Design brief:
part of a larger assembly, 14 chains, A mainly alpha, B mainly alpha, C little secondary structure, D mainly alpha, E mainly alpha, F mainly alpha, H little secondary structure, I alpha+beta, J mainly alpha, K mainly alpha, L alpha+beta, N mainly alpha, B: mainly alpha, 2% strand, J: mainly alpha, 1 helix, 16% helix, Large ribosomal subunit protein mL43 (chain K)
Amino acid sequence: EEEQVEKARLDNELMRWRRLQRAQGSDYDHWMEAETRRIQEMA
Amino acid sequence: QFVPLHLAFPRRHPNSWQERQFHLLGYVKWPKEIGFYNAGDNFELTPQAAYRIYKQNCDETFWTRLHNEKTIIHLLPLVEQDPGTNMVLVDDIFRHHLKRFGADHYIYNAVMQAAAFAKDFPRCEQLLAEMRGLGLEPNAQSYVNMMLGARLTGKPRDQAEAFFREGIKTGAISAVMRLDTEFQMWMNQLERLGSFKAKVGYLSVNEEGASPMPRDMWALWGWHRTEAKFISRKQMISEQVQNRVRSGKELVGTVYQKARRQPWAKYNGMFPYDYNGPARRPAASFVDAPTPTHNAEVCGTAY
Amino acid sequence: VQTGSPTHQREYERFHHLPGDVRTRPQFDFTFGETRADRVMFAWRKRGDLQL
Amino acid sequence: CVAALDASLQQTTENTQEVDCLSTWPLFTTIQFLVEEGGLPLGP
Amino acid sequence: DSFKEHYHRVHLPRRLALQRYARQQSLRNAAKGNVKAEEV
Amino acid sequence: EQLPRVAAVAAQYITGQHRPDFTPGMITGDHVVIVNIKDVVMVGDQWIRV
Amino acid sequence: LEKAWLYEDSIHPHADKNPRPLCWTDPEVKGWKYRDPQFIRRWKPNEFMH
Amino acid sequence: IFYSPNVVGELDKYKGELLETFTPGQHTNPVYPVDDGYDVFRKKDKEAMENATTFLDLL
Amino acid sequence: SLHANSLADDTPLVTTTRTLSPNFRAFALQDGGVFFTHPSHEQVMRVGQNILAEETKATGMTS
Amino acid sequence: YSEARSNYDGTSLPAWPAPGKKPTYPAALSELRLPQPRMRKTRTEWMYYHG
Amino acid sequence: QRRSVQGTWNPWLWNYETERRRTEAPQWRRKLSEKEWDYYVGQYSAQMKQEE
Amino acid sequence: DIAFIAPVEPPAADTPSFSELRQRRLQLSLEGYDISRFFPDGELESPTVTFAVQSHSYLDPFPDCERRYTATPEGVGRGNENVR
Amino acid sequence: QRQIAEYTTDPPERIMAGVTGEKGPLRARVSGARLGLQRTPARIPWTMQGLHR
Amino acid sequence: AHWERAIVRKNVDSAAREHGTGWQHLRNELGRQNVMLLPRSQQLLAQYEPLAF
């Protein structure tokens, strides 16, 4: 039970970490970088 | 720490946003004769409207045994109030069920409960015998219908104990305590339930919300704000398709999923609609509706 | 310009007549809690190598 | 057809006489063959 | 007269009146001939 | 009802502006009793940012 | 300002003055243009004749 | 001050049509209360204020 | 207001309908004016008093 | 007494239609050669229209 | 000198006069006729058929 | 005799929610016929849709090959996108 | 009667007829009938809102 | 003149709001119907001839 609770807590931490990195990497330079990379991928 | 991330109180939505979101989700304000939102803000369909939609959609390809069961369920209180005329409607439903789907535990248990409310214990016995003859073994629902009919008609404690012991022997009802305590528990449950006329049971409470639109559209049923009691029709259809595609994961509740469900790490940020109000969408107009001929008359209660 | 109290007119709305980034909501709000040493109340998004 | 027969039986029972009426015996024989040899549930 | 000072100066008699109205409900019981203290 | 809207609606009846014989000198008005102020609602993020 | 009677909860001692439930409409209510709903047209015998 | 008008006839308010007859008893335009029930947040006034018919002045 | 009703030339902008609106009768004049017939001040005040009494007869007349 | 005068000769169009017939109404939208935007006549335009 | 022939405005003149509607609106608590029953049940069944 | 018919839906189905439903189902549809040109509302698969007439006219043959020779929808359904 | 039951009943329904979950009956059995989607409680948690390919 | 006309306009607007309309619609419809009543006369009627207003 403790291992399951700890694993769920780690998964929630990973979720919130991805959410916070979506804003950390949102610095206009890296954001434009990812945007033009996605544009070249779809094109 | 003292600065709150989320806030449940005070509220974050005025009165106009209630109507805006109600019209945005895709719901329609039906008249009271069709249905309304009860005290628990749950949508409730009038038995008359249930029988009407039954008569109109009994021939379509999407009708189902479960739909007939729900129609009998909606008719149950009217059957309890007037067992003379509403039993005719129940019998018509059973006739159509035999025409389309045939013998089924669902329809048989539904008509057994209908007879139990209508105070027809000979009819309940006949239905049980018909199930046994057709080969549909009596289920736990059938034995509980037996017990309810016994308690309602006035059959004695030993008469109900006979059916409970028969259910135990058959195995449809699983008991984890002594038989006496199990029967006591079932009888206390049925006594707290009561009937639509016995002034003690829950069914005696006829108070209703009587509101065409729920009071709080952002009411939560679970834990987080994303588990809203009222959602859009696209998301509702998503839930409906998930209930059938992933019916296996519903069987087990594991502590992993339990601790994952905690929304302490879920994002709670103000979307643009949290500032601009719910997006304005047109409501379903009813210009094609005929003029109300009895607009001056007052509509009565459901049951 | 100042045409109201901070309850209604924010401090970053004084330069609302000037064109550019001031016509948007600032990201950082240092006006609450402890006051800064240099008395900075708002800071906009870091555009490239410049920040307001 | 059996629903029509049930409606007719209800009509003829809603009115000694109900036993000696000549109409009750053909319907009786029909439903007797239906439930004895046929196996109608008779529930509805 | 500051904002808070004026607010309290105009609201304190109203607060006392509200407390009096609250105790009027308690006095309702002793008025009917059944003096009963408040239960918590 | 939102705080600024309810405040404006209350003040329009407090100051007596809704009366056709309203005179700036004569301060006459109506007594407005505001109820359920604890359940007043402002749109999101305002309770924290204002 | 002294003519406003604020009350946190719903209870209030001003029951003798009999306050009328003031009704007010906010200036926000506005119906944005929506798509004209399509419905069947009801004809006429004289129209079909001529 | 004296006034002596030349009336043409009874005129309808809610409809621009000029009535050809005049009846001093019947209301030229019946007016009904506003209470639908569809609106849950409709600010309810007092019952007698919402439901209060009027007299007939011409009679 | 509403744009579809505002653009209409037959529907004026002001839309007020009250209890005494049917009592207010309209007639046409030859010069183009409108002659209105309304209840008197005593009659309007009497109607108001009757409404007040009909409202207060249930809960008793307070101070 | 009084003078009801709109033009030089005191004549005007029939202001009241026939009993039962539909009345005529002026133009509410401003005299604009473009259909958009639809704008209600202001009071000064109403004065200019009435003369 | 000021004077009124019809009467001086007083706060209790148009106080009890409330708003109304042009014509009769369909109530929510009303006895539905057979035609209305058929119409509304048909609309409900149609939207349910599309959802299904 | 020419009749301009068009697909119509009940008002309970003409809500924008079902409109978005149909648009999504058509953009996800795998059928060959072009959705943008053929049946952009889905009047062949929807059960509640009914083909109703909106305008009525007649065409008379010319005296050379065998009194109006041109037909155009009028009144209800004039210049609409669904009258197809 | 038996032949009509076997001819109308499908493998999924005849499999899920006798199944019961931990919260009660199966959600599929409970929501198999929907007299308008406004009557559906929508009892799916936020961890199960997602749907795989 | 600005303050005086603002006062008279506010009084007329309050008198119209007590009936159910506003200064905007009242003024526009007066201009339309070609009544030609100055705000001073509108205020005088609102204060001393409520039936006429």
